[PDB]
Design a protein around this ligand. Structure first.
Ligand code: HEC
Ligand code: HEM
Ligand code: HEM
Ligand code: HEM
Ligand code: HEM
Ligand SMILES: C[C@@]1(c2ccc(Oc3ccccc3)cc2)OC(=O)N(Nc2ccccc2)C1=O
Ligand SMILES: C[C@@]1(c2ccc(Oc3ccccc3)cc2)OC(=O)N(Nc2ccccc2)C1=O
Ligand SMILES: CCCCCCCCO[C@@H]1O[C@H](CO)[C@@H](O)[C@H](O)[C@H]1O
Ligand SMILES: CCCCCCCCO[C@@H]1O[C@H](CO)[C@@H](O)[C@H](O)[C@H]1O
Ligand code: FES
Ligand code: FES
Ligand SMILES: [Sr+2]
Lengths: 179, 256, 429, 256, 429, 179
């Protein structure tokens, strides 16, 4: 019956498993190690940040932008209509994933003075240049030419989305906790 | 120098199915923190590993609190800060106090017999047994041959073999008479020097076994994972060998 | 194979070795293979490529004896090589510019093949092995360029790994796995170093198979007419043995190539480089003018030519329900441009081997060569008008050549009669 | 940003037979120490290289004396000490002042024209020309478009192209009108700021040309060794190509 | 060679490929080679060696993705692997214990050859290629052991490089060149790293020639009687095709070896190691009990056995006017122990292939196997009495076996008649 | 004629030179680099060293022993006759190469208080153990069992020579310059 046909199948099946058991750990060693998986929040002192200054800080190997926006930056941001935006999602880890990209939903405070976001261009990961650059009074990405406005929303170029906003909150009067 | 006699402790983690005792590792962490850490560091052990499975397995909030006691120089900032779990334990505060990260593997307690290696083959390398023997091997009186010939700043220990020995403790061809030798570490332990929370006993024997076990985990944090993998491969390869045996047998039948 | 005379051990030492390991028999039969007599200077690029691999390997091993793959030490260890290691400056520039020589040579090697039909039957295997070698080369050169850990290294790595983040569904996993974390960091530098060392040996194994491939079929020649194999008599009128006739001719060409190459390395070693890579990697600031190495520029231009406004991109987005956006489309286009070239034996539907006797083909071929140069040039320009259109027309022609013209040409063209034999063409010269 | 125009200086080290002027490199070294070193470092240059051939070639006693002025932290000791020739030049004192070790190679002064690369092929990359142009390109009056719109803490420079620019200096599509942009470096030079020992003139032009040559050597100290080898390889291969040409020709002679 | 059937393309895909690249014909003729039917369990160690080479290579490439060759970071980078890298503890122990498995297998592989006469004609080339592989293995393993930069790493490197300082005249130059300075330092670690990566690929290339060598001649077998090649009829009575009969027999044996190997790695991964290599390199203090890895111990024992007081050293010193002192004599003795084993085809003067039919030979061979075990053991002891004598008698016998016994035996021994054929021997078992 | 005989020699000879010119720099890059060639002298503070103390210092990657010898060390060293020594050369870079290995020629000072030498065993480079170890009141090398006496001279074991004495001299009352 099925006694002499089955041995050559069961043996080959064990060999296939053995190869897979050898191959998976060879792949997973390149996945993030325990030292990387464990990187935790950081705190940034901000008392020294005047309006019109962007503070740039390293977090998870990438830049984080902290701009204390001026009156001009804030006025421009609220003046943009939703239907004029490339991406109408807030891209904000602190609120609903579906929240809309109004200027109020892009800042930590209700006054809209403190803009905290990942300084990582959403096209292919470069750093946009700040100091009121580009055609929308915000940031300009020199790698392939994306323009962001004064609230960090994408308006022009290859980038598909607004600069993502990390988990961020004032822990006290003068300190922001990222992550 | 040479090898010497160590006390054969029956640690839970020994044997193919041996595993760490979680409460003992926690007690040993307390002993390291309250006693050894004053002089010894563990510069290769990430503090966050006190939460990782297969160790003391402390809540991550406790570990976060534990890491604060260390003053660490931040890498980016360059200014001092409270310790985080992502930091390592500090270096040894005392310059000639060796780092204990890998001590349980950098010392062998079992040797011989005729340098055949058979002793280690059955009893293991014997590092945590060795550590235990040094913590225990401090006698109150030195050997009679050095009553008043002890090097200053050194202490007789039964198990320490790399220390100096007074001239009055050597035979006519210069070989030392004493079981051990003089170590620069003063006796660090003493009965109930630590107050364990669960009321576990804190004799020098008990703390020495507890801290020796903790230091074995600090050196080989993945001991339990390694054995699980060994068992798995061995059970697999037993099955695989049998199937390959029957295949080989049933194939050659049409030949002989 | 082709009819030829075989090896015979003569010395007493040769009779001894040949009856145990016929390695002497193999070198003789390899180096004395009858090769078509009428090969022109476009048949040298195989030896040039072979030399480059040895140059890169030998200078590479040496550089790795003084280099540290760690983000805190990598850039400094290269300056240590340049300043302190005996001859380190020269070994470094040879390795860097040697990569450029490696890539000028393949492209000339490839376009030779595309013109003379060295990819059409029976040479598909040679061609496919070649395509694998080329893919390995690009992967090798990329990771190599990251090791100095300059600004182009870091940000070039950021850009190129982002390509893989664009794959729907699995993109972010692939990107993290390649990086070893959330960003280009030490983990990325550390693993690229291991793979930069490994892959050149994989290339060597592929080249070994590559060489076996055209020895099995015999070398193509400018006429596309195969060596006559019915007898040793008429094979010799079409051929001469590889040694000495084409060994010395290749070695001569190599001496001329190296004369120019050593003038570059000696007198303008940085012309083909980017000054921003003499600046340490800064994960917080990006050079304004990041640009790839010239040998990646054509394919880079293809990637960035397909933006969201492109009409063909908007159909892809509509038909794919949003899955295929411009970012991922550009990635498909880039690997797609190489793939259609890999498939050219099955896209070129003409039975005529040599493009020398294909009047319409010559036009589209020389447009492709010009297109490749155009593509290289637009890759280094900005994406503003008109370069955005220039890159769209250039990308467009590349796919048209392989996917439309070549299939159509083989069913329309009126070819010229080739020579009767290789012998006929040689005597006329 | 973009590329721009640089003054085509005739540096001695340019051309295949070009070589460094030893006295010029020494003058440039004096400029670097007395002016630039206040803000800029050269963290990749070993101090001992001031004696090596193909550079300033200072006597080893002078170099030993020069190194003393720097305060170096010994790695093992951890305490500060006087500099030695085996130490590198210090890091930049000013955090946003770039390191000048490789500046003459990390900048291109010649670009274009239509991104064909023909300009660099004939005129070189132009890094020391660029450095010269920046040191020269500080005008007393800014461009008329920013009469009273200068960012505070920045200075207009003709050759610097990566700097910010006032809103009033851009056209309707936002591209800057000015030849240059605003740099955070104040004009560092001024007539006779340095007193050269050999009496060489110390106009802003002269110091800028001298220190640009010095910065080219600090960036490419082995330039002269590289060219001797280049000449040699070309001379070998010229001869070898001729011999290989005659051999190939005389071989195929017995065929056609 | 042996008479057997050749490949014939059957599928249309096979006919297509065979007419362009006969790689399937080559793989078929290889895996179906007629192999003597009467091979015993000592013929498995070739496959184990093949497996080890892949294990070392694959685990090695992976480890280099996380290791840093700098004295300040090397030891820390290995602990980073052990604690943080996914599976890093297992990959490291596999590579470390894998070197031991690699080396137990060669010694068993070698002594198989020494007993059954697998080095005698026509198998000298196979044997000599084998000796080069062994040298490459030793060189690879030495440099590999240095990379963690523990106390044994540093001081083992100090000692082993000091051996080359013992060469008259040129010794200090070779030593400085290997070290890159006055002492074992970073330059040494950095170059050992590059070379540790390279040499396994050189080994792989040598193994290809090795397999080509014993495929050209055919495997030796326990009787030493070669397969009959006069007809296909009688070749089949002496042989079976390698696939499936010996593939499956080897894969079975390999699974059993790995069962043991994985128990070591899983349950006693440090048994074969030295605890002092878990102590960071200290260039100012030396462990009291420094001892080499077990696979270097026999030759190390030979090296230190020839001291200045040994009568034969003092004659060498006097006759050579002081050039050959004890230190260099021991170095000559050490490489000499390996050399006489390479020359055994020309020292073994017996025409009988297999030692199974050599009564006196069996005695001296098993003494050599015993001597080798003894040599390994004394290698780990101090040089005081009696070990100084045990290592002198053991070293003396090693050279006596190859240089005196084996030459003399082939002109004195009365061997037993081997079987007429392999078939006769197989049926009797 | 010599027209057709000379080309095949001259061409190959050029090739031989070209290969050699390419191989030498591949070997010479492994010779000491300029950073290593440039290593210079060092200075050691000794004011804290009482008699019977050995100061151990790193110099060119190897240990240098600076021992302030006691009275016993000096007496034992001076009591050895030349014919009783394994190696009768002083191994002292500061004096003639032929000087004898008397205790006077093994110390820096006439009082014989300051013994400065490479702590590098002349067998195979290990570090001898100091203080008062071995069978000659000196140093013991644990690698293969060499014994040195109180002046650092080889007396027993495989080591062929006395521990070498580097260029060393007192720069002032309390500082020794090595190198
Ligand atoms: C200072 C007051 C110490 C404290 C508390 C502890 N140790 Fe210690 N230790 C100290 C010194 C100065 C030394 C060096 C000893 C020498 O002679 O070199 C040590 C050494 C050790 C060792 C090494 C023994 C060996 O084999 O080399 C071990 C294993 C060790 N110490 C363990 C240990 C433990 C577990 C401690 C807390 C219970 C502890 N030490 C405390 C100084 C001091
Ligand atoms: C490291 C890279 C390479 C090496 C060492 C190499 C080597 C060679 C050599 C020596 C030859 C014979 C001489 C000649 O015709 O020039 C050859 C032929 C050829 N190679 Fe390559 N080559 C390489 C890359 C490639 C690539 C990238 C391709 C294709 C995409 C390719 C395809 C071919 C073809 C089609 C031929 C013609 C063979 C024939 O006419 O039968 N090669 N190669
Ligand atoms: C086909 C083979 C190879 C190719 C195409 C190649 C390509 C490159 C390139 C483009 C660089 C960047 C150089 C620079 O910009 O400075 C590089 C760097 C480097 N390569 Fe390779 N390489 C090859 C083989 C090797 C091998 C086999 C090794 C090592 C054994 C090696 C070692 C290095 C090292 C150490 C660097 C960094 C040092 C430097 O920048 O010069 N390379 N390689
Ligand atoms: C990576 C190292 C090696 C590999 C993969 C390898 C592989 C093999 C294999 C697969 C065989 C087939 C029959 C058998 O298993 O005996 C073989 C045979 C043989 N090997 Fe190796 N070997 C290695 C090292 C060596 C060494 C170190 C020596 C000798 C010093 C050696 C000498 C021989 C001999 C004499 C034969 C028998 C040839 C014959 O029967 O014609 N090999 N080897
Ligand atoms: C094929 C034969 C090989 C042998 C016999 C060998 C042997 C060894 C040995 C004995 C060690 C010391 C391991 C320890 O005890 O800690 C080692 C370490 C190492 N080997 Fe290999 N190796 C081989 C191939 C390779 C290859 C191809 C690589 C490629 C990268 C490699 C990478 C390493 C690395 C990175 C280390 C240091 C990390 C560690 O110690 O675990 N090895 N090797
Ligand atoms: C040399 C080079 C390179 C070489 C081959 C490449 O080919 C690919 C390799 C892998 C994946 C995709 C493409 C890509 C870049 O490496 C590298 O970082 N750059 N620089 C660069 C600059 C801007 C954007 C992207 C890259 C290269 O040119
Ligand atoms: C692994 C090992 C080793 C392996 C093979 C060797 O073979 C040789 C390599 C080079 C030259 C001569 C022999 C030598 C050392 O390298 C190493 O550090 N050790 N350890 C050691 C310890 C004391 C003295 C000398 C060495 C080895 O065993
Ligand atoms: C000899 C081949 C089988 C090896 C696996 C047997 C299981 C080993 O198990 C090991 O035994 C050692 C003492 O024997 C102990 O020190 C270890 O705790 C234990 O893991
Ligand atoms: C065209 C291939 C040969 C190139 C070598 C020509 C010699 C180039 O020479 C170089 O020219 C540059 C200016 O163009 C100068 O900047 C360099 O100093 C000079 O070495
Ligand atoms: S990366 Fe910012 S635009 Fe492409
Ligand atoms: S190294 Fe000192 S005795 Fe051999
Ligand atoms: Sr026990």
């Amino acid at each position: 019956g099925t006694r002499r046909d089955f041995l050559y199948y069961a043996t080959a099946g064990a060999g296939a498993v053995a190869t897979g058991a050898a191959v998976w750990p060879l792949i997973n060693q390149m996945n993030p190690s325990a030292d990387v998986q464990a990187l935790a929040s950081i705190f940034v002192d901000v008392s020294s940040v005047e309006p019109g200054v962007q503070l740039t800080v390293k977090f998870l190997g990438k830049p984080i932008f902290i701009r204390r926006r001026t009156e001009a930056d804030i006025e421009l941001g609220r003046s943009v209509q939703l239907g004029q935006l490339v991406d109408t999602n807030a891209r904000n880890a602190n609120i609903d994933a579906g929240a809309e990209a109004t200027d109020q939903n892009r800042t930590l405070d209700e006054a809209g003075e403190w803009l905290v976001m990942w300084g990582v261009c959403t096209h292919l990961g470069c750093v946009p240049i700040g100091g009121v650059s580009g055609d929308f009074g915000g940031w300009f990405c020199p790698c392939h030419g994306s323009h962001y406005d004064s609230a960090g929303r994408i308006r022009k170029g290859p980038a598909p989305e607004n600069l993502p906003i990390p988990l961020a909150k004032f822990i006290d009067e003068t300190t922001i906790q990222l992550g | 120098a040479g090898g010497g006699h160590v006390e054969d402790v029956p640690f839970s983690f020994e044997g193919p199915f041996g595993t760490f005792d979680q409460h003992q590792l926690q007690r040993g962490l307390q002993v390291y923190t309250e006693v050894c850490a004053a002089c010894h560091g563990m510069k290769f052990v990430p503090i966050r590993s006190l939460s990782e499975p297969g160790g003391p397995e402390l809540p991550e909030d406790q570990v976060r609190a534990y890491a604060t006691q260390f003053t660490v120089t931040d890498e980016e900032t360059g200014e001092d800060r409270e310790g985080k779990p992502t930091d390592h334990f500090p270096h040894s505060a005392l310059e000639n106090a060796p780092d204990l990260s890998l001590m349980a593997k950098a010392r062998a307690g079992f040797h011989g017999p005729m340098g055949t290696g058979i002793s280690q083959l059955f009893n293991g390398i014997g590092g945590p047994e060795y550590i235990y023997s040094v913590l225990t091997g401090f006698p109150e009186e030195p050997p009679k041959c050095a009553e008043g010939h002890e090097p200053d700043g050194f202490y007789y220990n039964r198990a320490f073999q790399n220390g100096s020995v007074p001239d009055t403790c050597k035979d006519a061809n210069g070989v030392k008479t004493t079981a051990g030798s003089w170590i620069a570490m003063p006796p660090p332990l003493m009965d109930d020097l630590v107050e364990y929370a669960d009321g576990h006993d804190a004799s020098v024997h008990a703390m020495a076994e507890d801290v020796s076990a903790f230091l074995m985990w600090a050196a080989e944090p993945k001991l339990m994972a390694r054995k699980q993998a060994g068992f798995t491969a061995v059970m697999f390869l037993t099955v695989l060998s049998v199937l390959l045996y029957l295949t080989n047998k049933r194939l050659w039948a049409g030949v002989k | 194979g082709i009819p030829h005379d075989h090896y015979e051990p003569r010395t007493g030492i040769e009779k001894w070795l040949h009856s145990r390991l016929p390695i002497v028999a193999l070198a003789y039969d390899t180096i004395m293979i009858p090769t078509p007599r009428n090969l022109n200077w476009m048949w040298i690029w195989g030896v040039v490529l072979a030399f480059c691999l040895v140059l890169q390997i030998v200078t590479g091993i040496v550089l790795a004896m003084h280099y540290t793959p760690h983000v805190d030490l990598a850039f400094a260890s290269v300056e240590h090589i340049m300043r302190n290691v005996n001859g380190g400056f020269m070994l470094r520039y040879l390795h860097a510019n040697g990569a450029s020589l490696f890539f000028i040579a393949v492209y000339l090697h490839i376009f030779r093949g595309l013109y003379y039909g060295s990819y059409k039957a029976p040479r598909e295997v040679t061609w496919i092995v070649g395509m694998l070698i080329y893919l390995a080369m690009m992967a090798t050169a990329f990771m190599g360029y990251v090791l100095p850990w300059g600004q182009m290294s870091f940000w070039g790595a950021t850009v190129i790994t982002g390509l893989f983040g664009a794959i729907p569904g699995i993109g972010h996993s692939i990107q993290t796995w390649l990086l070893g974390g959330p960003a280009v960091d030490n983990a990325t530098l550390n693993r690229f170093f291991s793979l930069h060392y490994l892959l050149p040996f994989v290339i060597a194994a592929l080249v070994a198979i590559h060489i076996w491939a055209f020895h099995s079929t015999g070398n193509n020649n400018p006429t596309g007419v195969e060596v006559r194999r019915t007898s040793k008599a008429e094979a010799q009128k079409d051929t001469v043995p590889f040694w000495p006739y084409f060994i010395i001719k290749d070695v001569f060409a190599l001496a001329v190539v190296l004369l120019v190459f050593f003038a570059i390395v000696g007198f303008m070693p940085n012309y083909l480089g980017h000054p921003d890579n003499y600046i340490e990697a800064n994960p917080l600031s990006t050079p304004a003018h990041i640009v790839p190495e010239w040998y990646f520029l054509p394919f880079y231009a293809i990637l960035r030519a397909f933006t969201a406004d492109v009409w063909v991109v908007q159909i892809a987005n509509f038909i794919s329900f949003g899955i295929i956006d411009a970012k991922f489309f550009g990635v498909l286009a880039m690997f797609g441009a190489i793939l259609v070239m890999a498939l050219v034996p099955w896209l070129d539907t003409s039975p005529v081997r040599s493009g020398r006797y294909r009047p319409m083909f010559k036009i589209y071929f020389w447009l492709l060569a010009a297109d490749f140069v155009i593509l290289t040039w637009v890759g280094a320009q900005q994406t503003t008008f008109p370069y955005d259109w220039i890159s769209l027309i250039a990308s467009a022609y590349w796919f048209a050549y392989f996917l439309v013209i070549l299939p159509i040409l083989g069913a329309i063209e009126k070819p010229v009669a080739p020579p009767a034999t290789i012998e006929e063409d040689f005597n006329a010269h």
